[PDB]
Amino acid sequence: AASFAQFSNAFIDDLWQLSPTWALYSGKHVNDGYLEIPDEAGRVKTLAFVKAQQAKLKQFELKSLTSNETIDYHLIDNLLSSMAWDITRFKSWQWDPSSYNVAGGFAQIINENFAPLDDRLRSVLARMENIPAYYAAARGNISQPTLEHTELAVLQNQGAFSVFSDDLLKQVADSGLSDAEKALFKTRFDIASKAINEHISWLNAQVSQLKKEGARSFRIGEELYEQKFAFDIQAGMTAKQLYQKAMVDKDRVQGEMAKITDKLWPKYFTTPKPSDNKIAIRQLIDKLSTKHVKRDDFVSEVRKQIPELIEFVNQKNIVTLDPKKPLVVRETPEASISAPGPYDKLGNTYYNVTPLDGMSNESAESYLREYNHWILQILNIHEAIPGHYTQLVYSNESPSLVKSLFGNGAMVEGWAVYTERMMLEEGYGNFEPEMWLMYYKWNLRVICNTILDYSIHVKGMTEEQAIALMMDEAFQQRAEAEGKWRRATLSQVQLTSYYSGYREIYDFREEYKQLKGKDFDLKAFHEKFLSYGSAPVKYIRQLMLE
Ligand SMILES: [Ca+2]
Ligand SMILES: [Ca+2]
Ligand SMILES: [Ca+2]
Ligand SMILES: [Zn+2]
Ligand SMILES: [Zn+2]
Ligand SMILES: [Zn+2]
Ligand SMILES: [Zn+2]
Ligand SMILES: [Zn+2]
Ligand SMILES: [Zn+2]
Ligand SMILES: [Zn+2]
Ligand SMILES: [Zn+2]
Ligand SMILES: [Zn+2]
Ligand SMILES: [Zn+2]
Ligand SMILES: [Zn+2]
Known part of the structure; x- marks a missing residue:
């Protein structure tokens, strides 16, 4: 039977298996080459994780815990409830287009100038594969967006080109990657650049439509505000x-x-x-x-x-x-x-x-x-x-x-x-x-x-x-x-x-x-x-x- 300490460590391991980008941002490189596609299977899979980890949590008697463990217990419980609630009620995945942007994950990999370069570039090589899919998923999920977050999306996704840059291409060209890896990189980079630019055009068409037709309010209202306030x-x-x-x-x-x-x-x-x-x-x-x-x-x-x-x-x-x-x-x-x-x-x-x-x-x-x-x-x-x-x-x-x-x-x-x-x-x-x-x-x-x-x-x-x-x-x-x-x-x-x-x-x-x-x-x-x-x-x- 797992101790609470064993469970805590297994929980973090499972969290990182579900979201290796979250792991990356936390400083653990579990799978930098894997870009999660934020589609409905993503949400289903997140909700199945919430359900299974919650049921593991409920196996521990609260009287069986030390003070640190009880803090961890509550932080985990609350994080889990708020994940579920984000997916099923808050639904920023629908109305905040700024939550769809690949630039962040790529910058975290690339900008570690102390980590081996060939390992970083191979991670980026693999992570580029699904960029078109990522933004196709974005466009299929977004619904009744706010004007403000859509405008932010345009601006932040334009910034993706300070990562997907001539300078990144030069690093690749002069790295120790094989000639085959370099050519694959170029092929994927052109496909990625095209997809980002087409997404930005789509975002621009959305802002224009939202300005003419009206848009969801940015004000989240009392019910959501209180729930968010309790979780955060x-x-x-x-x-x-x-x-x-x-x-x-x-x-x-x-x-x-x-x-x-x-x-x-x-x-x-x-x-x-x-x-x-x-x-x-x-x-x-x-x-x-x-x-x-x-x-x-x-x-x-x-x-x-x-x-x-x-x-x-x-x-x-x-x-x-x-x-x-x-x-x-x-x-x-x-x-x-x-x-x-x-x-x-x-x-x-x-x-x-x-x-x-x-x-x-x-x-x-x-x-x-x-x-x-x-x-x-x-x-x-x-x-x-x-x-x-x-x-x-x-x-x-x-x-x-x-x-x-x-x-x-x-x-x-x-x-x-x-x-x-x-x-x-x-x-x-x-x-x-x-x-x-x-x-x-x-x-x-x-x-x-x-x-x-x-x-x-x-x-x-x-x-x-x-x-x-x-x-x-x-x-x-x-x-x-x-x-x-x-x-x-x-x-x-x-x-x-x-x-x-x-x-x-x-x-x-x-x-x-x-x-x-x-x-x-x-x-x-x-x-x-x-x-x-x-x-x-x-x-x-x-x-x-x-
Ligand atoms: Ca899929
Ligand atoms: Ca103003
Ligand atoms: Ca005044
Ligand atoms: Zn596991
Ligand atoms: Zn790192
Ligand atoms: Zn469905
Ligand atoms: Zn107590
Ligand atoms: Zn409690
Ligand atoms: Zn002065
Ligand atoms: Zn007053
Ligand atoms: Zn002074
Ligand atoms: Zn402060
Ligand atoms: Zn003084
Ligand atoms: Zn002084």
């Missing part, structure tokens, strides 16, 4: 509940900002203070944003700050940090943490911080105003200490393949957002009003991301309303607002992840303070919270309370 975020509340909390937080945050602005106004202006609080807040913020690190010192300011945050976390006993896992700041190759995937045992972990070269003087200045004297410190909390990097180190204490592959984005992001608030509450920057004001504008991004995503998909918010939210309520620039609208038209639920995890973590903390009273230790709370890795916050709560 795995919050301990509904989306409607989170939205209602986001509306209240927006008001609380703006009220605090108005108070700070009243106190700081005479310190920075001699002109009168506008009676509309929101114009006043916007003007004070624009003025404070001119204090920023000099452009050429951006990367150095970051290196200087990280040890300052380390010192502060140690001094205040916020969480144990290990001095011999020193974080290496590096100037980004072609600000975020990059870390090896579960199948990459070699790779190192860095803090990628992009120097401001390439950009115009004017873009650089706009960037430095966004990442100003205060916001740069908050960014380094979020990204490095005690945010993402710290949480990643803690998750390396008790890892599992399942958590590494299918872990919860809401928890990972929610933690990083939580740390910003917790650090300031614990005295970071010594309760400086400027710092709090800037933090609050930053917090509004996260709150308003939730309002926006929900209101668009559930409440029919218009483009003009979405732009006025982001600019007038969250004090963002035009370009940022427009980018956010576009992202919300093309994706659903992901935008709520930041606030959802933050709210659950902070509320769980306050609940735990209540339960332990005088015996509440902040540091012990943090370390125990981080010990489960990237599990959904509600499961961490349940394990910590049980």
Whole structure:
């Protein structure tokens, strides 16, 4: 009889046999030469896999599992339910033509310049076989598409030619493949190129028809939104509940900002203070944003700050940090943490911080105003200490393949957002009003991301309303607002992840303070919270309370 550990490993093996492209994206090259044709037999086969793996899952008593195993159990169960639901209910395979594009799988094979070239090219040689079939399947599946995803499909499939390029042909011509393999490659490449171009023509004809005749709305509606929110975020509340909390937080945050602005106004202006609080807040913020690190010192300011945050976390006993896992700041190759995937045992972990070269003087200045004297410190909390990097180190204490592959984005992001608030509450920057004001504008991004995503998909918010939210309520620039609208038209639920995890973590903390009273230790709370890795916050709560 298989143990749960044996089952977990067999499950991943079976998942990769069903979808070797998913394996490829996860960093395991089980069959790079096999292009899955996304037709009805594909869906039937996915649903037969869901059914068989679910029945294997149900053989394990939940009382028979350790804490890590129970996390894996739930992550697997939820992944399975959401696969089935994607096929039978959400049906993005019908209305999102952008989900049909071969370029991605090919780029992952080709762009590993360390992997043997002849092996890569032979994988590509085989993977090209079924490109015509792949796009024939696409056209037979697509039905009542949205205008927006069809437009995205055109643009992304046009990008396929930066992979299916003259440069790929040259690599093939000068490789160690046999002359017969080279000629086959050319034959298949011409057939592939023709098929991609004919599909793009078809997509163009569709966009044109959708513009004339009307198209399915991009707004997924309440029923689908709640189901997607449950599968993706795995919050301990509904989306409607989170939205209602986001509306209240927006008001609380703006009220605090108005108070700070009243106190700081005479310190920075001699002109009168506008009676509309929101114009006043916007003007004070624009003025404070001119204090920023000099452009050429951006990367150095970051290196200087990280040890300052380390010192502060140690001094205040916020969480144990290990001095011999020193974080290496590096100037980004072609600000975020990059870390090896579960199948990459070699790779190192860095803090990628992009120097401001390439950009115009004017873009650089706009960037430095966004990442100003205060916001740069908050960014380094979020990204490095005690945010993402710290949480990643803690998750390396008790890892599992399942958590590494299918872990919860809401928890990972929610933690990083939580740390910003917790650090300031614990005295970071010594309760400086400027710092709090800037933090609050930053917090509004996260709150308003939730309002926006929900209101668009559930409440029919218009483009003009979405732009006025982001600019007038969250004090963002035009370009940022427009980018956010576009992202919300093309994706659903992901935008709520930041606030959802933050709210659950902070509320769980306050609940735990209540339960332990005088015996509440902040540091012990943090370390125990981080010990489960990237599990959904509600499961961490349940394990910590049980
Ligand atoms: Ca077939
Ligand atoms: Ca528009
Ligand atoms: Ca406005
Ligand atoms: Zn098997
Ligand atoms: Zn690889
Ligand atoms: Zn049929
Ligand atoms: Zn359960
Ligand atoms: Zn309100
Ligand atoms: Zn400046
Ligand atoms: Zn400094
Ligand atoms: Zn500074
Ligand atoms: Zn300062
Ligand atoms: Zn983050
Ligand atoms: Zn339990």
